[PDB]
Predict the structure of Urease accessory protein ureE.
Amino acid sequence: IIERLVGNLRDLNPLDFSVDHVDLEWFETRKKIARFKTRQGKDIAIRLKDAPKLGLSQGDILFKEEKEIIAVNILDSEVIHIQAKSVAEVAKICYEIGNRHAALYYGESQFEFKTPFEKPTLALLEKLGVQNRVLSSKLDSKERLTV
Amino acid sequence: IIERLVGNLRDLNPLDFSVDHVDLEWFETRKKIARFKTRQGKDIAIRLKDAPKLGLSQGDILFKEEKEIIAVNILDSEVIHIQAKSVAEVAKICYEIGNRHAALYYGESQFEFKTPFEKPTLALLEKLGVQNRVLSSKLDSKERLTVS
Amino acid sequence: IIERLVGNLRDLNPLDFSVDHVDLEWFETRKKIARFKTRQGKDIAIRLKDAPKLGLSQGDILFKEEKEIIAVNILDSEVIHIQAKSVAEVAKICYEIGNRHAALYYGESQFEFKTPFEKPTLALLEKLGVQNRVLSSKLDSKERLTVSMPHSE
Amino acid sequence: IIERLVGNLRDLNPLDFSVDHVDLEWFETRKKIARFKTRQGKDIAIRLKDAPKLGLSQGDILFKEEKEIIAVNILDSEVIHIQAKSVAEVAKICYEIGNRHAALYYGESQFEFKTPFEKPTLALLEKLGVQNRVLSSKLDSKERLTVS
Ligand code: NI
């Protein structure tokens, strides 16, 4: 029964280790009491203090033992990436989506923002006519914009 | 009844023209119709074709008889003035506010933003710890952020 | 690839059968295109000719060939239950929550109601003080309460 | 400057008095502070200590000198009068209106509620086959449901 995180694979870790991942959808990282069957059949429960608020993230270690580990993996989803030309054009998108109540994440870079696919968020984005694309990928809860 | 934009005395206009405007509070800027009595107690009503979708801007030139101008003044209001420290910070603000369903205006510099004062909001802005000042101020219908 | 329902188990079916439930979370019952894994091996896609409007329900028969059945189990989750004293009160909750854009479901009797636990939704429910216990419980689609989308459909 | 809700009229008091009325719409009762022109000529100096949440109700007695009084008349407005046939349906309605962040008031009959008139809100009410009827009427902020 897991209680606290031993950090992240990201912070090396050249692996090197055996890793059992725990495969979680994006909408599932804030779960607090939970039971899980791991990637390799294994069992693992979670009951956390100072649960990372924003959510659990890519490669979060639930369990390290010698060279054995369990990390969180975060399953890829359908996703609208967004490219604002300008700092104004950012504010505009963001308020807009806010107003919509959609979810919203930072991109890999400056004027990039990903939010889940939804046919009407598309809609919006075309209306105001912005640079988007749908790409199966990864919305780390670390990237989110507070509820 | 009055009908046409002839613009906005931003195109100075160091007057040259004795001025008499109507006073709308900032949201009353999108009546498709209504009547009021101007600031020097004169009369005229409204009708609306093609009046810019965002609302009436500051100094929207209504009437003209020689030099004697009838137009629009937007009263100043209590206003939260936000200074973002980074493009990230902006986005947060906007999403967060736009979600609140509150209303937003672009500011003076790239990173400045203006919304009506409320407590819920001010509050919020401090539970995110952005720097801002509460000021009394005009809100051009033109620097509003749209919604759709 | 599955097309439409074959009724429910409420229509017994005193099983007497081998149900292989597919396991839905509360908000998953309304997709019409999605790929599943039954409780045991089987792969299962759904493409739904005339989906029920409010969603899939408890043990709706997704697949009925011979004895071999595959029905919908709906997972449990933390529900704020709500028992509320009068028609006035009801009317508040509901309004206050619709504004919150939260999910909301008719409970067992005329006065009770269920909603997904979040913290805000609860925090207020005390802040205005209606009777409510939080319970691991099932949220039946059949018993929703339209939707929304928030603001304009 | 007025503070005092000197009281409210319906505590008879059956005039008894000359009473000058000042006429606001429902949307205008909200403020602690701002200014005005009365039925017969005049103009109001005020702020509000205990601005009863809700706001300025009907004939909340503002100023009072002899049989010389002013107080709040509130104008009629189109209103949607709703008759929910059961609590099942009370809930579906309330919720679905709150979901529009629209406005809503307790009724008079038992499964009656009232909300401003808006062409989409209407649109709503018929989709559900809830039965209503649009009437010009009063709106007591003593009757608006809250949102916290
Ligand atoms: Ni909303």
Q: What stands out?
A: DSSP finds two helices and nine strands in chain B. Residues A 101; B 101; C 101, 150-151; D 101 surround nickel (II) ion (CB under 6 Å). The first helix of chain B runs from residue 87 to 100.
